[PDB]
Design a protein around this nucleic acid. Sequence first.
RNA 1: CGUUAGUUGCCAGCGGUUCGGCCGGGCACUCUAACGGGACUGCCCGCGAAAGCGGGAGGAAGGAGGGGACGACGUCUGGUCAGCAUGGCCCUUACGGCCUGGGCGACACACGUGCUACAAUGCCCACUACAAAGCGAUGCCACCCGGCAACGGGGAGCUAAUCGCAAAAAGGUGGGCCCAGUUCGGAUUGGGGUCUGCAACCCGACCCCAUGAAGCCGGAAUCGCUAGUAAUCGCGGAUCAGCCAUGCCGCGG
Lengths: 98, 155, 60, 127, 78, 24, 120
Amino acid sequence: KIRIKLRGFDHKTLDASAQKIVEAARRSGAQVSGPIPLPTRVRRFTVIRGPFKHKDSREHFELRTHNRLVDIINPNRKTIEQLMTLDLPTGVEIEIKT
Amino acid sequence: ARRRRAEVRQLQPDLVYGDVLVTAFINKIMRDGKKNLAARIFYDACKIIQEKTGQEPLKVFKQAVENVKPRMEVRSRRVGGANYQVPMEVSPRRQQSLALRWLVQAANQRPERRAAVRIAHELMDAAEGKGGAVKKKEDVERMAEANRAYAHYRW
Amino acid sequence: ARKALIEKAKRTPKFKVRAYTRCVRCGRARSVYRFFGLCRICLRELAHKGQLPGVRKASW
Amino acid sequence: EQYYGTGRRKEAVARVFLRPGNGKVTVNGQDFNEYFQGLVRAVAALEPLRAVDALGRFDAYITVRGGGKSGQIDAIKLGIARALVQYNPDYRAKLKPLGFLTRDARVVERKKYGKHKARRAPQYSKR
Amino acid sequence: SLKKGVFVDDHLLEKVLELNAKGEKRLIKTWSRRSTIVPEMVGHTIAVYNGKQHVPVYITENMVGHKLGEFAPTRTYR
Amino acid sequence: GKGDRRTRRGKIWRGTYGKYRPRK
Amino acid sequence: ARIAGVEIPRNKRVDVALTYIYGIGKARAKEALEKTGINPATRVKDLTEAEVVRLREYVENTWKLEGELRAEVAANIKRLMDIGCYRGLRHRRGLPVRGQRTRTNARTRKGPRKTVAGKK
RNA sequence: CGUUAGUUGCCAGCGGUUCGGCCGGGCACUCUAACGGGACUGCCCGCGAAAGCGGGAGGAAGGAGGGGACGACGUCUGGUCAGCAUGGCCCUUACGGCCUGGGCGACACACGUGCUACAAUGCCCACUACAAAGCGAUGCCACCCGGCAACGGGGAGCUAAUCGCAAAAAGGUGGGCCCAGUUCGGAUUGGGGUCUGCAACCCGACCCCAUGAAGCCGGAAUCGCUAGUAAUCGCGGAUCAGCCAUGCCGCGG
């Protein structure tokens, strides 16, 4: 059983690059507790459209932090093959835990 | 309503007497979307109809209404001169709207301090026919007729 | 007096409290989000360029 | 031995397990009339049974979360129907006239900017 | 309204205290309206700034609790 | 109600706590 | 039942009835009917004359009340006249004393309304 | 509605339970979130040349299913040189700069927008998992002890579907008030405190005691809203030491 977490602003290149930790610890490894999605945390930003008085008419921005979770139950180094340095993220962060 | 003719909204029947008319009446009683306390009052009033008269609260209520439905009213209409009140026959939907409306309004003017009582007595008083609800009814029938001179417009 | 003021918005102040935020590219005092150091204005600006990562046009 | 449906209504969801027998109905470790106690419209929830004459010849363990009581009541009402037609798929062409099988799409519509409250608009003054 | 200290400007007392070792001064003048009056530091006459000028206020007992700006009002026509 | 601080509802509204609305 | 100063509250619950004294609120009442053990629920009407004295002497010697207050509070304010603290000319002028606006409102402290005109 | 996935979710199915989803056990269900399916005027009747209008079944959804984002050529010489950018003109021992105080918070008056109300479909106290978005490791603060309380000691937990803000309120049940300017309403003022902060006089909010105002539903005018809408009740966030938030942006009952 090994714990890694994966955060990200981008929803597509997480399920992708964490089905990369699926396959690169499936090919070279064994049994998997699959990718489970923690709920997302949306940071809202609401701003009036104008430089000056126009208190109505505003625009709406969000910063959704998608969270995806992946653990696997064979802590071997015949898994940390690709999981050494075989990288296609870009702006994903990783939390390898025990 | 410039476009269609507005489909009259159909009401979920009563959880007791299974009557749509009942619920309608319960809504008119409701205040700030408190249907529970609303229906408590109406039902706990149906209880007062028993403890005092033999008859089933429904047939009281039901026939109490039919005595508060107006048959004619006056709707204004100006011209190239002044504003005149043409007496107009009153369509079935509006009759119910008005009776039920009037019932409650009439009720909450009464003296007894508890919602359930007032609804009851008023219903009861209007079944007999002596209600101040029924005054607002005779007054419109009388406010037509008085303008009978003008029922040659009608639109 | 916007200038002598933008180069005082940076100075470590006598007494903690007198500290205040500021648009990094406005020098703007009011409505400055903590998360960006940006005025509400210069912010709608960048978010539209695309220079504000993961910041989307919120719709629901 | 067992039949089931999922009831939902206005962010309120009901796991509904049916069984034959007796007449009792469990909800979240409580009797019906202790949970929906002194709430007039509760009995609506079981008008599905009262339609098909399933009446109380059924028992029902129901957990439910989301919403407030009167949402749940309509949610359960949907589970009861979505369960007992999964017992008898012929129990459909009689729950159509009453329509006890429709999610009921109505939910809190969004608050809009520059209003107050979605449709409620702020107050005009002209002069 | 405070309870650990009385938060009076220190640069004020130094004047007062060291004016309280045979000291009779009336030309005492300050901008420290933020500072609480203190026990029996009476007799003196502190001129206080109202934002435009200094106000010759004589200090009695009874007013011991209050702050100095309560006696130099900052406006006109009440 | 909502403006008597010494009612529970006056506290709820004000959003505070105390004698007339203590936290369990 | 006469209590403080001259007060004769009657025919309502003592806890409320107590209120009719200058210096008693629902607070100081809750106390007296427990630090002297009297059911608050009971009307003054039906109420022991032994319980009245336990009350009358408690309340009257537990705290400054009714007309002493009135004359303290009044003299307490004319203190703020003194040399002339701010709340002085404020009570002096009859305008809000606890730092609130005055452009609008302040009608409770400024009696009714005295209106004027203006210009062309 | 369907796949994919199981440190959030359960006897739905069985054994221990200090009867708390807490321990194995399990993802069926609820949920969390990615991709799909689905509705199109396709089918039956009716009128029409057609597009399409009235119906009817099937179906979670039927004719734009509901709500957003999206604002044509252009008008108001609309707004903004005070967000920023910029032509010109103007001051350049001062129209630049630094500080300490004061002011933007004034008050005979007048309007806008709101808030709390005038009570019995009501107010007060007690007791009771209805849980649907968000925020928090120079912070959220469980849980202790002191304190009427504000808050102060102490200290657990979580870079947070796991720990905390969390009580949701209207509600249900119990008791109390009995029509009264009242157990309605909480303005004003006296006093005693807490907290943040260099510092709360001008000018902070919060607690507690005392005080308890006008207000009995509002002239002539006039505002919003067509369905989960209006009405009503709480909830969170942004700014932010703190807060004058009853504002604004959202959320659900």
